[PDB]
């Protein structure tokens, strides 16, 4: 008892209680820590765009030249005899901006032979949007405006129309190398631009010059004219037509039974709110 | 092969001989001498005879 | 029934052989794992009720099984089902101590498949109840004993399917 | 019995008609629960 | 892009005809109710943040799995993406409501959206629900605002609902 | 039912039903029309009885809807009222038959073992049933309320 | 299950006879042929995924209307059951390649085919067109006797469906 | 004891003790002095052990010692520790006997019915026993602590 | 996920280049540094429980009003979600310690932080004060280069929130 | 991008947990063997050109059809492409070897590669073989280098092999 009197009364006086705050346990079931970026975009999530700044030694200039060549020509090998040594020398001398170096590369006969002479006009427009603007076409009307400008003003004026666009200046300025952007949602961007950018961007190992049965065909134009589709994922990532089985948890059944349970559900919530269970008097014990 | 795969190809000789009596003759085997005569013919002359 | 040790004795008795080197090696392979079997049994026994509750929670209840039309609907049948679960757990603990599955055949599996067919007891659902108890058991008993406990739960479940 | 001795598996065996009532009774007779409580404390003559 | 007038015009043209007196007066009525429409669009704009916030609080109240590891609204990056999508959809619903036509919503937002989410592993049923909650609160605001002239906005509340319901249906 | 109970005892002495174990059946038949009516009345107000039972319960025992309580939370409370809906249903069955019979097989034999596993406090389930008696009984005439009350007190008794 | 081995054994058994030089010569054919067969099998096996998606799509491209609402190429379940079915065919083709005969095709797809397709309103034309497409693409995965083998069995399915 | 258990099985099969039965009596009796030391240590610290069990218990279940709790109050708590003192005593008996015969007849057979009547939450009594294991075990060498621990886990087992 | 290893590899890849002595020297830094990092990690790991309860409370002691009714430090759910959140931060600090870079912090807490906190009416000040407190106590759990590492990452979070 | 630590972290996070003492010591061991790892990566970098060259000489020694007209390593343009691909793959294998994880190899190099080659008409079995030859020579160098301290590098030689074997399997 006495062990009770001494080590036990004040202790109960609320000290015993304080309360019961703490935890949390778990914790969503399944996996996926910041992966999705696994669909070949891990490097790209947001690719880090290379800015070249003044009083630059060289190593930075050599890195910007490599980045600009990787962006404009993809993963395609370029011979040392095929490099535009004059444009690289003008960039090394700070005599041209990164924007104007890209203009000289895009107007070059090498870019004309690989992307213009070997490809359909619509696929050439799809690729210019990829290389110069880092994005897919938003509407079939955008492909039509570039095609009409090409037909009226010729090749060099189509290239200038991408580089003198307010969109190019707003996003890359004069000193940033273009980088792939279609993996982000921008304000005013179509949701279909992500799927189309992914169809155009076959991952880092992708060659835009591939003569094998799809690479010269319009990957995006088939879809654009209308309501019909998505982009080929080369398809071992778009889950190869998973047919959307339907992630629905065992709770599915509770929903069904309680729908009767749901009449009691409201009553649950409804009396919970009028009520708080902090009250613990409970007994009467008359 | 319709008859051969079903009633011959996966059974023993007793089941096959008694199935011949049910299918072709429509009756059951009468004694052991009917079975010991037919299988001797099977081993001597094959399934076609 | 038989255990590791009597499995060997009876295999030699029918040949009338004294135990030889191969026999003696087998028996050693049992004795050398013996202390670990005991510790594992004491964990299972003392957590029996919690293992059933966590196994039922992951694999049986909150489902059509416990709803009208389901085989574990009614307090009667819910009680019969977790009663069964306790049998499985308890006997698997015997098999694992003995280091021999023979008791699971003699006193648990014999006729059980057809008994369940005759009452309507869902076999696939019962297997999940077995493999959920295994999952819990393997956490509680630790590295030492996990694989050895596990096999007799797997013996039970391929005995029904 | 306050959920005592009883018959785990014994009840399912008797119901199911796997075992018959005579048999179940015989099992019940030779068991620990029985030996203790009726033969644990008696000379050889009243237990019979 | 279409609005309710432009839609009329496209259907008329496909007949090779000047607008029918039928269609004319349907459009005269839209002009008749346009002050109410402006208040309805204004109701959403003026409470956009709270509409998204309140929808959000409630979505995660219901679906506490999304904010556990792995869950699709965990860690901060994913929650920000989810909050951003709630805003994007509320935005195109308000555009449709100013326009009197769903097309901007269907063409710029809903087209391809389901297949995006499935590719991403984003649970579409949860996204549908977040849209249902935005609807409840948005309409709440359309119906009970600051010193607007008293009248009947049920026609507009319905139409707003169908835009919320289009989005939900399209996504689930 | 009353029928099942009478008959089962009859076959047990290899005998015919006697003049007593007929009178009860006759009483039950007259009672059954009234009994059927009471069950229908109870069925009509089921949602109100359950909900008001659930409020009466959580005032009297707030501990079950508290941190370490079996019914703590919105969906641990939803299942709790569903169980209260189950038992009201069984009570209507018991009343109509005239004998408790089926309710026992459906919801008391095995109930200790079920709830012990789930760790549900049995005596507070008995309280939830008293709470339903109080509500249901206020929707019935004095005579019918008593007749119903016996079946409520049985369930309260069996969870014990 | 029909293979060169089972066929010669069946023919021996039915005459109550040991296998003789006639029957063993036959078996050598089946064994000599295994290399080409099994190369076809490995190529069809690893390309299965895309061969199936290619043929499924081609059924919709050749029968555009199938993909409209109210039709049998619409909704996840039809399109799912289609991929599955072509996958069944390619699977049994590989089995027939590996087995040394049409047995797997005869027992698991041909026996009963028309009755099933007729009850379920499945047109053979789709399946022929799935297979014609698979035959087009298998032209560049294989060559020589592996291609001839692949062809033999694809064509066997197309004749079963006509 | 080990003796009682061996003999009862012997007499019930009308026979002398087995080699096995004789062996265990021998191994058991060899551990006599050790078992007596284990009981002494724990007897010597009894007042400390119950208390530390009692603190461990009320942290883990502050509710038992709360308005609607079986052990709520100074004298409802005094009886609770007294019950913890009872079970520690029985554990010392079991250790010196080498089995549970005594522990069982004195304090587990009938314990469900006793505590159900008093409405004592059985599983929190099992916790009080785990708490005593933890304290007692910290006053014993590794080998003796394990030997003691089996008897604590038995009681924990029987209240189940 | 940003670590010394991933950074040098990224820089090589982007110039189409094998790893050279520059990049391997860098990697050696990360490996040489692992011991101090991982000691900090183990200490933060086992003290997690109390570091979290200490910081949670300190948020209420520094912002007393939070714990009054109608406020965001009131009721079980707010106070629960708070402990959890500080626990998330300590968790990613240990990850950043073990990983050899800020990656885990950048990817799981920094990316999106402000948008989330702004929508949910969560003041960074609380979180800074949680972290300032955690920094005070970690002064006596560690010393030398393990403390410097712990500090580096705690401070990194505080700057992310200012 | 993942390395061996980052991988640990992702798996821990999916549990909602601080790294297990299990995982901690696995990573302590990686730090333990890291000097050897640096030598192994250095072995490849320091002989990259010869590894590619020697693999190449031997590939065309075996498969003289590739260097005939009609062959996929003819004319100079195609041979340069083939030599370039040999370098690219050797490069991502060395990255994986510094990282202690295959992901950079699988994500930036192997993903889609087979389907590229098939589209191009590039014989994948020949490419697989060129990778097998690079493996032989690369490991040769990992095992027998300039004045490195003597010890056991077999664990690392295995791991390097699996990266070569991943690539081969993925491509063939
Ligand atoms: C329109 C056609 C065209 C011309 C003519 C041209 C000249 C030119 N020469 C340059 C550099 C250069 N030019 C030279 C040339 C020489 N060094 C000597 O000592 C000799 C006297 C002389 C060779 C005979 C050198 C060394 C540099 C590099 C200067 C430096 O970066 O330090 C640069 C700077 C950009 C660069 O380095 O690539 C330009 C633009 N660029 C053009 O696009
Ligand atoms: C055409 C107009 C348009 C729509 C509608 C659109 C939806 C859309 N939502 C996305 C992601 C997302 N959407 C959400 C949304 C939610 N998360 C939840 O838990 C809630 C249930 C719900 C908010 C109510 C989240 C969390 C992500 C990121 C998923 C991830 O990366 O893990 C993505 C992937 C690209 C990205 O993350 O930016 C698209 C394309 N994109 C568009 O261009
Ligand atoms: C992500 C890193 C990456 C990889 C791995 C890559 C592979 C790749 N190899 C290609 C071509 C090629 N690859 C080869 C390779 C070979 N030919 C043979 O006969 C041999 C079996 C083999 C050398 C071992 C050849 C010959 C071509 C040119 C095919 C042609 O144009 O006809 C192409 C087409 C673009 C181009 O020719 O530049 C790509 C994208 N591209 C990348 O960006
Ligand atoms: C499916 C292939 C097949 C087999 C295997 C077969 C066995 C077989 N053996 C039989 C008889 C027989 N089998 C034997 C064999 C033996 N007697 C001995 O003492 C020896 C131990 C043994 C020889 C090694 C004898 C003696 C009979 C005649 C029994 C009798 O009629 O009394 C019979 C009864 C029909 C008949 O006599 O023809 C069958 C069906 N029949 C078949 O169709
Ligand atoms: C018709 C015969 C019958 C009954 C009665 C029955 C009850 C029953 N109650 C359950 C749960 C439950 N039942 C309750 C009930 C309560 N919680 C409390 O604290 C109160 C004392 C009480 C409400 C008055 C709770 C809280 C759960 C959830 C327990 C858990 O999930 O662990 C479950 C498991 C969930 C499920 O799968 O349905 C069953 C089967 N099943 C039956 O077949
Ligand atoms: C000592 C070895 C031994 C075992 C294992 C055993 C099993 C066993 N399970 C039985 C019934 C049953 N068993 C279950 C089991 C289940 N219900 C479900 O839905 C679940 C899938 C599953 C639990 C996981 C149920 C519900 C019944 C009652 C069937 C009835 O209503 O008659 C019966 C019929 C007799 C009885 O009801 O007790 C036996 C004998 N008997 C034995 O002697
Ligand atoms: C800056 C852009 C702009 C806005 C927003 C605008 C609003 C606007 N709302 C008006 C009326 C109104 N607005 C409402 C709206 C409502 N009534 C309700 O009870 C609902 C809560 C709510 C439903 C949306 C009603 C009922 C009227 C009076 C009837 C009418 O004029 O149609 C009027 C007519 C003058 C008046 O009666 O106050 C104007 C000018 N005008 C503008 O130029
Ligand atoms: C072992 C070998 C095997 C084969 C070959 C097979 C075919 C087969 N296809 C079926 C159904 C089906 N088959 C299809 C086929 C298609 N739908 C489309 O989008 C395309 C037009 C087309 C693919 C070219 C469809 C839509 C159904 C569902 C028919 C129904 O139940 O209404 C069914 C009916 C059972 C079921 O619904 O699954 C069988 C048995 N089953 C087998 O076991
Ligand atoms: C993976 C890394 C990660 C972080 C850091 C994170 C923060 C975070 N804190 C949240 C809520 C919260 N955060 C708190 C924080 C506090 N409350 C208090 O008592 C204190 C003042 C304070 C702690 C210092 C509160 C009260 C909420 C609930 C806000 C609400 O829904 O109203 C939510 C909204 C979703 C939810 O309700 O859980 C996120 C995403 N989430 C993450 O996934
Ligand atoms: C510039 C980047 C960099 C490199 C490359 C580096 C290498 C390096 N390798 C070392 C050891 C070593 N390196 C090896 C490697 C090998 N042993 C063999 O027999 C194999 C042929 C080869 C297999 C790869 C061995 C066995 C040791 C000694 C054991 C050890 O320190 O782990 C040591 C410890 C000092 C020593 O014992 O020499 C360093 C610093 N350190 C660096 O900072």
Can you give the resolution of this entry in Å? 2.8
CA distance E168 to E146: 29
Q: Mutate which of E49, E64, E72, E77 to disrupt the I interface (most I C-beta within 10 Å)?
A: E77
Report the largest interatomic distance among the alpha carbons of chain J, rounded to a whole angstrom.
60
DSSP string, G35-53: HHHHHHHHHHHHTHHHHHH
Q: Is H70 annotated as a binding residue?
A: yes
CA distance A42 to A31: 17
- From the CA of E82, how far away is ligand 2's center (Å)? 5
Q: Which residues pair with J160 in a beta bridge?
A: none
Residue having the nearest C-alpha atom to atom 2 of ligand 7: E38
Residues of chain A contacting residue J80, judged by C-beta atoms under 8 Å apart: 77, 79
Phi, psi of A176 (to 5 degrees): -95, 135
Q: How many Cβ atoms from other residues are within 10 Å of residue B43's Cβ?
A: 9
CA C33 to chain centre: 18
Q: Is B4's CB within 8 Å of G10's CB?
A: yes
Q: Which residues pair with A176 in a beta bridge?
A: A51
Q: Are C134 and C149 in contact (CB under 8 A)?
A: yes
Touching pair C, G by Cβ (3+ pairs < 8 Å):
no
The structure tokens listed for C102 are 């023979």
Report how this structure was experimentally obtained.
cryo-EM
Query: Residue E59: CB partners within 8 Å, gap ≥ 6?
Result: E66, E126, E129, E130, E133
- Residue C152, CB-side half-sphere exposure with 13 Å CA sphere: 28
CA distance G14 to E82: 72
The structure tokens listed for B8 are 């011959």
Query: Residue D6: CB partners within 8 Å, gap ≥ 6?
Result: none
User: How many residues are recorded in chain J?
Assistant: 172
**Which CATH number fits the domain C1-161, given the four candidates 1.10.490.20, 3.30.565.10, 1.10.3720.10, 1.10.10.10?**
1.10.490.20
The structure tokens listed for F124 are 């507070």
CA F36 to chain centre: 15
Q: Which residue has the tokens 């308890």?
A: C90
Residues of chain F contacting residue A283, judged by C-beta atoms under 8 Å apart: 60
**Burial (0-12, 13-18, 19+ Cβ within 10 Å), J92:** buried
Minimum Cα–Cα distance from G42: chain J residue: J172
- CB of I55 closer than 6 A to ligand 9? no
The structure tokens listed for A66 are 């490599």
Report which of I41, I22, I16 is spatially closest to residue I145, judged by C-alpha positions. Answer: I41
Report which of E96, E99, E71 is spatially closest to residue E6, judged by C-alpha positions. Answer: E99
Report the b/e string of J114-126 with b at 16+ CB within 10 A: bbbbbbbebbbeb
- Residue E62, CB-side half-sphere exposure with 13 Å CA sphere: 13
CA distance H71 to H60: 14
Query: Residue E100: CB partners within 8 Å, gap ≥ 6?
Result: E3, E4, E5, E30, E37, E159
CA distance A206 to A203: 6
3-state DSSP assignment of residue J107: helix
Touching pair B, H by Cβ (3+ pairs < 8 Å):
no
User: How many residues are recorded in chain D?
Assistant: 48
Helix J34-45, helix J21-32: angle, nearest 10: 50
Domains along chain G? 1-162 (1.10.490.20)
CA distance J128 to J114: 10
The structure tokens listed for D12 are 């399912």
Query: Residue D17: CB partners within 8 Å, gap ≥ 6?
Result: none
CA distance I137 to I51: 8
Listed by number, the residues of chain A in 241-260 with a beta carbon closer than 8 Å to a beta carbon of chain G are 241, 243-245
- The CATH number linked to J73 is 1.10.490.20
The structure tokens listed for H38 are 């284990």
DSSP string, C94-159: HHHHHT-SHHHIIIIITTHHHHHHHHT--HHHHHHHHHHHHHHHHHHH-TTTHHHHHHHHHHHHHH
CA distance G19 to G27: 10
- Three-state secondary structure along I21-66? HHHHHHHHHHHHHHHHHHHHHHHHHHCHHHHHHHHHHHHHHHCHHH
Helix (H) or strand (E) holding A23: none
CA distance F35 to F95: 6
Report which of G158, G162, G48 is spatially closest to residue G95, judged by C-alpha positions. Answer: G48
Q: Is H34 annotated as a binding residue?
A: no
Residues of chain F contacting residue A263, judged by C-beta atoms under 8 Å apart: 47
- The CATH number linked to F22 is 1.10.490.20
Report which of A253, H81, A194 is spatially closest to residue E112, judged by C-alpha positions. Answer: A194
Q: Is D8's CB within 8 Å of C115's CB?
A: no
CA G121 to chain centre: 21
- From the CA of F135, how far away is ligand 10's center (Å)? 83
Listed by number, the residues of chain F in 32-61 with a beta carbon closer than 8 Å to a beta carbon of chain H are 61
Q: Are A280 and H66 in contact (CB under 8 A)?
A: yes
Q: Are I33 and I143 in contact (CB under 8 A)?
A: no
Q: How many domains does chain H have?
A: 1
Q: Is F68's CB within 8 Å of H63's CB?
A: yes
Residue having the nearest C-alpha atom to atom 19 of ligand 8: G73
**Structural domain of residue E153, as residue ranges?**
1-172
Query: Ligand 1 atom closest to Cα of A89?
Result: 38
Q: Is A40's CB within 8 Å of J115's CB?
A: no
The structure tokens listed for J90 are 């050797």
Helix (H) or strand (E) holding A226: none
Nearest-Å Rg of the Cα atoms of chain J is: 18
A203: left (phi over 0), alpha (psi -120 to 50) or beta: left
**What is the CA angle A276-A282-A286, rounded to 5?**
150
Query: Residue A198: CB partners within 8 Å, gap ≥ 6?
Result: A39, A182, A183, A231, A233
Q: How many domains does chain E have?
A: 1
The structure tokens listed for I158 are 């505080």
The structure tokens listed for F84 are 């209260």
Report the largest interatomic distance among the alpha carbons of chain E, rounded to a whole angstrom.
60
Q: Which residue has the tokens 């059980």?
A: C112
CA distance G27 to G23: 6
> What number of C-beta contacts closer than 8 Å exist between B and G?
17
* Cis bond before residue G148 (omega within 30° of 0): no
Nearest-Å Rg of the Cα atoms of chain C is: 18
Query: Residue E117: CB partners within 8 Å, gap ≥ 6?
Result: E123, E124, E127, E171
Helix (H) or strand (E) holding B21: none
Q: Are G9 and G20 in contact (CB under 8 A)?
A: no
């Amino acid at each position: 008892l006495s062990m009770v009197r001494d080590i036990f009364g004040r202790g109960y006086m609320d000290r015993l209680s304080q309360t019961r705050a703490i935890d949390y346990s778990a914790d969503q079931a399944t996996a996926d820590g910041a992966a999705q970026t696994k669909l070949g975009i891990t490097a790209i999530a947001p690719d880090q765009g290379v800015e070249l700044r003044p009083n630059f030694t060289e190593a930075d200039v050599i890195t910007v030249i490599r980045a600009a060549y990787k962006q404009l020509f993809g993963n395609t090998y370029i011979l040392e005899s095929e490099r535009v040594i004059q444009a690289e020398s003008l960039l090394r001398n700070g005599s041209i901006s990164v924007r104007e170096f890209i203009r000289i590369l895009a107007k070059s006969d090498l870019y004309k032979e690989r992307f213009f002479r070997c490809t359909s006009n619509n696929r050439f427009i799809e690729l210019n949007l990829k290389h110069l603007l880092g994005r897919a076409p938003y509407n079939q009307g955008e492909i039509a405006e570039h095609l009409d400008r090409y037909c009226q003003s010729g090749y060099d004026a189509e290239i200038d129309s991408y580089i003198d666009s307010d969109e190019y200046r707003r996003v890359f300025g004069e000193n940033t190398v273009p980088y792939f952007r279609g993996f982000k949602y921008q304000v005013g961007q179509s949701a279909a631009a992500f799927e189309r950018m992914r169809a155009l961007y076959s991952g880092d190992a992708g060659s835009d010059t591939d003569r094998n049965q799809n690479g010269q065909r319009t990957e995006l134009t088939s879809g654009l004219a209308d309501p019909a589709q998505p982009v080929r994922a080369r398809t071992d990532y778009a889950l190869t037509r998973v047919d959307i089985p339907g992630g629905n948890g065992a709770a599915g059944r509770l929903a069904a039974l309680d729908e009767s349970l749901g009449s009691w559900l409201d009553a649950a919530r409804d009396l919970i709110s009028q009520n708080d269970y902090s009250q613990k008097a409970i007994e009467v014990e008359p | 092969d319709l008859y051969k795969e079903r009633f011959f190809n996966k059974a023993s000789n007793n089941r096959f001989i008694e199935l011949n009596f049910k299918h072709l003759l429509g009756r059951a085997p009468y004694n052991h001498g009917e079975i010991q005569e037919h299988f001797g013919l099977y081993h001597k002359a094959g399934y076609d005879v | 029934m038989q255990d590791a040790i009597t499995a060997v004795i009876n295999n030699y008795d029918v040949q009338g052989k004294y135990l030889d080197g191969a026999a003696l090696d087998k028996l050693k392979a049992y004795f050398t794992t013996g202390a670990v079997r005991v510790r594992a049994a004491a964990v299972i026994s003392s957590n029996a009720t919690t293992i059933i509750k966590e196994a039922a929670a992951k694999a049986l209840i909150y489902s059509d099984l416990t709803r009208p039309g389901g085989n574990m609907y009614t307090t009667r049948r819910y009680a019969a089902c977790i009663r069964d679960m306790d049998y499985f757990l308890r006997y698997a603990t015997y098999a694992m101590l003995a280091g021999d599955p023979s008791i699971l055949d003699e006193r648990v599996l014999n006729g059980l498949k057809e008994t369940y067919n005759s009452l309507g007891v869902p076999i696939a659902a019962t297997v999940g109840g077995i493999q959920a108890m295994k999952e819990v058991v393997g956490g509680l008993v630790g590295p030492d004993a996990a694989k050895e406990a596990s096999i007799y739960f797997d013996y039970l479940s391929s005995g029904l399917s | 019995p306050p959920s005592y001795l009883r018959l785990s598996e014994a009840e399912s065996k008797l119901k199911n008609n796997e075992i018959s009532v005579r048999e179940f009774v015989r099992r019940l007779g030779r068991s620990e629960n029985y030996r203790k409580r009726f033969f644990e404390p008696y000379s050889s003559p009243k237990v019979v | 892009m279409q609005d309710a007038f432009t839609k009329a015009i496209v259907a008329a043209d496909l007949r090779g005809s000047f607008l029918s007196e039928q269609e004319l007066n349907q459009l005269t009525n839209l002009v008749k109710e346009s002050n109410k429409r402006l208040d309805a669009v204004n109701a959403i704009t003026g409470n956009a943040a709270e509409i998204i916030s309140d929808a959000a609080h409630k979505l995660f109240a219901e679906q506490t799995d999304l904010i556990r590891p792995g869950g699709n609204a965990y860690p901060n990056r994913r929650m920000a993406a989810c909050l951003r999508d709630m805003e994007i959809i509320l935005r195109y619903v308000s555009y449709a409501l100013l326009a009197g036509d769903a097309s901007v919503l269907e063409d710029r937002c809903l087209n391809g959206l389901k297949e995006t989410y499935v590719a991403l592993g984003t649970p579409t049923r949860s996204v549908a629900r977040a849209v249902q909650l935005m609807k409840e609160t948005a309409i709440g605001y359309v119906n009970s605002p600051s010193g607007v002239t008293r009248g009947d906005c049920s026609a507009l509340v319905n139409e707003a609902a169908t835009y919320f319901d289009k989005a939900a249906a399209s996504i689930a | 039912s009353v029928l099942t109970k009478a008959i089962v005892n009859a076959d047990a002495e290899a005998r015919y039903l006697s003049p007593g174990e007929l009178d009860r059946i006759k009483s039950f038949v007259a009672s059954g029309e009234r009994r059927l009516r009471i069950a229908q009345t109870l069925t009509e107000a089921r949602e109100r009885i359950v909900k008001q039972a659930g409020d009466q319960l959580f005032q009297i025992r707030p501990d079950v809807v508290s941190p370490g309580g079996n019914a703590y939370g919105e969906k641990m409370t939803a299942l709790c009222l569903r169980d209260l809906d189950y038992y009201l249903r069984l009570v209507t069955y018991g009343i109509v038959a005239g004998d408790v019979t089926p309710i026992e097989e459906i919801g008391i034999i095995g109930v200790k073992e079920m709830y012990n596993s789930l760790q549900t406090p049995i005596p507070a389930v008995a309280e939830g049933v008293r709470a339903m008696k109080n509500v249901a009984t206020s929707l019935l005439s004095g005579d019918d309320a008593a007749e119903a009350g016996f079946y409520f007190d049985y369930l309260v008794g069996a969870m014990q | 299950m029909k293979t060169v081995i089972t066929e010669v054994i069946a023919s021996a058994d039915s005459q109550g006879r040991f296998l003789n030089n006639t029957e063993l010569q036959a078996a050598n054919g089946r064994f000599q042929r295994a290399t080409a067969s099994m190369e076809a099998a490995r190529a069809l096996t690893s390309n299965a995924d895309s061969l199936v998606k290619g043929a499924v799509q081609e059924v919709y491209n050749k029968f555009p209307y199938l993909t409209q609402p109210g039709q049998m190429g619409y909704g996840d379940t039809n399109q799912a059951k289609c991929a599955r079915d072509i996958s069944h065919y390619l699977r049994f083709i590989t089995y027939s390649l590996v087995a040394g005969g049409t047995g797997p095709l005869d027992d698991y797809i041909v026996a009963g085919l028309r009755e099933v397709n007729r009850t379920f309103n499945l047109s053979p034309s789709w399946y022929i067109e799935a297979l014609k497409h698979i035959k087009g693409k298998v032209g560049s995965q294989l060559s020589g006797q592996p291609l001839t083998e692949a062809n033999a069995y694809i064509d066997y399915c197309i004749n079963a469906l006509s």
